[PDB]
Amino acid sequence: KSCCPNTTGRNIYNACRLTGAPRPTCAKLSGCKIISGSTCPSDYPK
């Protein structure tokens, strides 16, 4: 699962991936957290 902190970031993340970029990169570019669990951490509610 690819969660995110701020709403703004979540948006940029989608765009990055929409182009064909990897999860990791986009996660660091926008600021989204990449985990395995099926839930979002308190830190990244978005």
β 2-3/33-34 pair status: antiparallel
Max Cα distance, the chain (Å):
29
Backbone CA torsion sign across 9, 12, 37, 45: positive
Residue boundaries of the structural domains of the chain = 1-46
* Residues 27 and 33: beta-carbon distance below 8 Å: yes
Q: Rounded to an integer, what distance in angstroms lies between the CA atom of residue 43 and that of residue 15? A: 22
The answer to whether 46 and 4 are in contact (CB under 8 A) is yes
d(CA 19, CA 5): 21
Q: Do 34 and 24 meet the contact criterion of CB atoms below 8 Å apart? A: yes
Three-class DSSP labels, 12-36: HHHHHHHHCCCHHHHHHHHHCEECC
What is the distance in angstroms between the CA of the first residue and the CA of the last residue of the chain? 12
Give kind and range of the element (H or E) at residue 11: helix 7-19
